[PDB]
Design a protein around this ligand. Structure first.
Ligand code: G1I
Lengths: 52, 277, 331, 232
């Protein structure tokens, strides 16, 4: 069963991966861009709120 | 002097009962079949501490009932109703514990919230019928001249009652619940002892006595001395003085304040009290 | 020979992931303003379950949600009016998962019976009973009205075809009992965490494991997928929640505190991805700022442990289901 | 939109009535978990992916949910059985020498794991020591002594307060009580009165097992109620 494991590890060995800085910047940009349409982050006005 | 201690008693009763009621109401985990009876008992003790005790303290200190005769009769009826409701609710709680311990498999079927509401309502209707109906319809009115003079004058109020009503009220309020509670708690003590012996026999390698001692001792030492003299003063006219009667009545009143300290102590109730305070 | 090659490959993976660490996420994020205190109050409390609840799933309309409990019943609520639209009895009393189809016509459930039951709401009979899993099911999700993905305790995840009722493909090579599963918004990929610390990323169409993340130390009880589609946060039993990145291949941040020592049972993300809401065994949920790993609030209305947590597609409401058989919807 | 709301409210009322009926049904029954070892003899007991057996005694409904297969050392599913009335544990007391660590030691480890579980910090365990006849045959006639596989047996002496069978040998009673005490030590060490262990010596031919389970469940609920009111 070691052959399957080593083959899987070899398959997972070579993937083009970006630097952590770029990924963190992308996540920050996504969080900032869509922050306006977040009822939980910014409380919705009492009017048009479905529950209250 | 006397005003300070009575005010403290009123404050303690009201505070404890409102804490118990709000702890049951606010927290959903505290709502249980037994806790419905606990809530009924707390409501009885709270209406006690609100109407029965402050008015009695005012009557004692002022030495005159400044309120109307109708208000005097209403206060007496509320007093009887609260006392009998509290004692019968204690009896119902004892019966619920007895049914939970003695017959555990059928306890779930026997006790239900819908059925518990019926039990509480029946207890309160019995209390109402035994308190309001005879007093308001003036069936408790005595016949001797002293009672006529006391009740004719609206300035002063003292409890003068017939032999029949006094005996019936005592039996309905205390003695029958006393018998029921003594029987059921002797039984649950017997199962507790048997379970302790079984545990000792299985795992060879006190608490029930203390708990039942508190539960029965506070109730007996609070209400039995009052009801003995309640019967006696009817049996012998000159045996019991008014001051002793009132003192024992207030000793019985203090049971309402003492009651949450013994019936509402538990990890869940302690946590709820800590959260509220 | 083979073991030495595997060890060398693992060392190569560790070295490659080390070289990608240009800067920690906290270093970049510390400049941006904090979210601030977040206060959420229970708007709706859903009552009617007898025993403990394990799973819930918000409908695509954000109006209907389905909850599963050990009662053997699958109650479908209406969150706005607090009305039970359907109450589906189940053949097996023990269930551990539930799902809501995107179309709203189908609902699935599963548990210790090793069988995934799919119910047809619009017709509440059992549309199909899916058998083939050796162990208990832990989580189910709907790709479409015909494809369902189930994660079981036999250390294998499977993709079924509802009409055919057979495993179209089986995801193997996982060393622990899979506990939670989540889908990408494009439904091309999905992730799964198991008892073993590693959490894997799969490809639905091909059926192979693209990537593996092993940052945790204990059982992976919960998993959620970032709305962007390039990250996913896992909740484990070691009182830590960690944010992994598919493109970076290693963790970015670790959400934990010394005060809390209980495991995490359910995790979810807000619509913008800023707030990571995680359930806990310490009887209440925590709201984590996903960007700075700073807690923003608590949800302390539950009496028993929180077993499931979810956020509506519209993002308006957060519903948590606990073991006290009470569903509470926060906002 | 009022008609739709009224219809939905009527559906809610019907569902609530059905839920109340099912609530009465659910509270009526008692749930038990059978968690014996494969060799211990779960089949013999259950004769009198998950197997459910519904048996009622004295108008009390018991449901015994015995997990089938799922042969995993790690037991995540055990947290599901947090509300069961009792956990019925079946152990083969005649397997003190079988290796397929010994079987008895594996059962001891499993019992210790069940006892020391955060979710099972209240659930009591009913212990059945099956295959009593085989244990007696091995101890009496067999040349393999339990002392070799259990070193602590040498210093062990039979309890003064014991209940030997009407026709039973001394040495086999010593062995049986030692095997019982092995589980009882684990039972007594951890649990501080919330849950207890009920060790019963079961034989394959015994038919009173249902009565034993009924009595043990009654004792469990009685002790739970007594401890709730601080009477024990
Ligand atoms: C005015 N004080 C009353 C008079 C008689 C009485 C009381 C309480 C309970 C009863 O069953 C009674 O019959 C006393 O509190």
């Amino acid at each position: 069963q070691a052959r399957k494991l080593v083959e899987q590890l070899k398959m997972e060995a070579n993937i083009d991966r970006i630097k952590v800085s770029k990924a963190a910047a992308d996540l920050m940009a996504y969080c900032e861009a869509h922050a306006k349409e977040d009822p939980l982050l910014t409380p919705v006005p009492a009017s048009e709120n479905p529950f209250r | 002097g006397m005003g300070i201690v009575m005010s403290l008693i009123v404050l303690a009763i009201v505070f404890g009962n409102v804490l118990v009621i709000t702890a049951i109401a606010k927290f959903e985990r505290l709502q249980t079949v037994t806790n419905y009876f606990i809530t009924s008992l707390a409501c009885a003790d709270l209406v006690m501490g609100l109407a029965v005790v402050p008015f009695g303290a005012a009557h004692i200190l002022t030495k005159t009932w400044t309120f109307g005769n109708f208000w005097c009769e209403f206060w007496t009826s509320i007093d009887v109703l609260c006392v009998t409701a509290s004692i019968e609710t204690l009896c119902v709680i004892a019966v619920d514990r007895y049914f939970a311990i003695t017959s555990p498999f059928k306890y779930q079927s026997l006790l239900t919230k819908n059925k518990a509401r019926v039990i509480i309502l029946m207890v309160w209707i019995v209390s109402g019928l035994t308190s309001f109906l005879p007093i308001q319809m003036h069936w408790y009115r005595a016949t001797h001249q002293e009672a006529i003079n006391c009740y004719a004058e609206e300035t002063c109020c003292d409890f003068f009652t017939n032999q029949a009503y006094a005996i019936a009220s005592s039996i309905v309020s205390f003695y029958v619940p006393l018998v029921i509670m003594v029987f059921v708690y002797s039984r649950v003590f017997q199962e507790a002892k048997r379970q302790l012996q079984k545990i000792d026999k299985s795992e060879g390698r006190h608490k029930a006595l203390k708990t039942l001692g508190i539960i029965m001792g506070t109730f007996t030492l609070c209400w039995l001395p009052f009801f003995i003299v309640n019967i006696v003063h009817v049996i012998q006219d000159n045996l019991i003085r008014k001051e002793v009667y009132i003192l024992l009545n207030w000793i019985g009143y203090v049971n309402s304040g003492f009651n949450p300290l013994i019936y509402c102590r538990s990890p869940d109730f302690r946590i709820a009290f800590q959260e509220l305070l | 020979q083979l073991r030495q090659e595997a060890e060398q490959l693992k060392n190569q993976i560790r070295d490659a992931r080390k070289a990608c660490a240009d800067a920690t996420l906290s270093q970049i994020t510390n400049n941006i303003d904090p979210v601030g205190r977040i206060q959420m109050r229970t708007r709706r409390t859903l009552r009617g379950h007898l025993a403990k609840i394990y799973a819930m799933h918000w409908g695509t309309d954000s109006r209907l949600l389905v909850s599963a409990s050990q009662d053997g019943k699958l109650i479908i609520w209406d969150s706005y009016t607090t009305n039970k639209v359907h109450a589906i009895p189940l053949r097996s009393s023990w269930v551990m998962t539930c799902a809501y189809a995107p179309s709203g016509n189908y609902v699935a459930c599963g548990g210790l019976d090793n069988i995934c039951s799919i119910y047809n709401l619009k017709t509440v009979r059992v549309s199909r009973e899916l058998a083939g899993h050796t162990g208990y099911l832990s989580c189910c999700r709907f790709l479409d009205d015909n494809q369902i993905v189930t994660s079981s305790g036999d250390t294998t995840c499977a993709l079924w075809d509802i009409e055919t009722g057979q495993q179209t493909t089986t995801f193997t090579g996982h060393t622990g009992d899979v506990m939670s599963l989540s889908l990408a918004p494009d439904t091309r990929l999905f992730v799964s965490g198991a008892c073993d610390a590693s959490a894997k990323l799969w490809d639905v169409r091909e059926g192979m494991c693209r990537q593996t993340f092993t940052g945790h130390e204990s059982d992976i009880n919960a998993i959620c997928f970032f709305p962007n589609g390039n990250a996913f946060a896992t909740g484990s039993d070691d009182a830590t929640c960690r944010l992994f990145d598919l493109r970076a291949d290693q963790e970015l941040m670790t959400y934990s505190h010394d005060n809390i020592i209980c495991g995490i049972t359910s995790v979810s993300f807000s619509k913008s991805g800023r707030l990571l809401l995680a359930g806990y065994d310490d009887f209440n949920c925590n709201v984590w700022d996903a960007l700075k790993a700073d807690r923003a609030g608590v949800l302390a209305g539950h009496d028993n442990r929180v077993s499931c947590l979810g956020v509506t597609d519209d993002g308006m409401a957060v519903a948590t289901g606990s073991w006290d058989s009470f569903l509470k919807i926060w906002n | 939109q009022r008609n739709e709301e009224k219809a939905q409210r009527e559906a809610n009322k019907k569902i609530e009535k059905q839920l109340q009926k099912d609530k009465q049904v659910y509270r009526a029954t008692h749930r038990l978990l059978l968690l014996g070892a494969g060799e211990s003899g779960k089949s013999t007991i259950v004769k009198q992916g998950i197997f459910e057996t519904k048996f009622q005694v004295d108008k009390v409904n018991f449901h015994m949910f015995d997990v089938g297969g799922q042969r995993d050392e790690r037991r995540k599913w055990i947290q599901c059985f947090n509300d069961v009335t009792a956990i019925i544990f079946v152990v083969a007391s005649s397997s003190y020498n079988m290796v397929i660590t010994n079987r008895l030691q594996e059962a001891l480890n499993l019992f210790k794991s069940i006892w020391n579980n955060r979710w099972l910090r209240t659930i009591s365990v009913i212990l059945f020591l099956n295959k009593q006849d085989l244990l007696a045959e091995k101890v009496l006639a067999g040349k393999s002594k339990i002392e070799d596989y259990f070193p602590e047996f040498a210093r062990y002496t039979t309890p003064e307060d014991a209940t030997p069978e009407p026709g039973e040998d001394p040495r086999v009673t010593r062995a049986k009580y030692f095997i019982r005490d092995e589980f009882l030590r684990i039972s007594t060490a951890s649990g501080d009165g919330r849950h207890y262990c009920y060790p019963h010596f079961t034989c394959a031919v015994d038919t009173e097992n249902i009565r034993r389970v009924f009595n043990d469940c009654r004792d469990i609920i009685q002790r739970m109620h007594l401890r709730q009111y601080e009477l024990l």
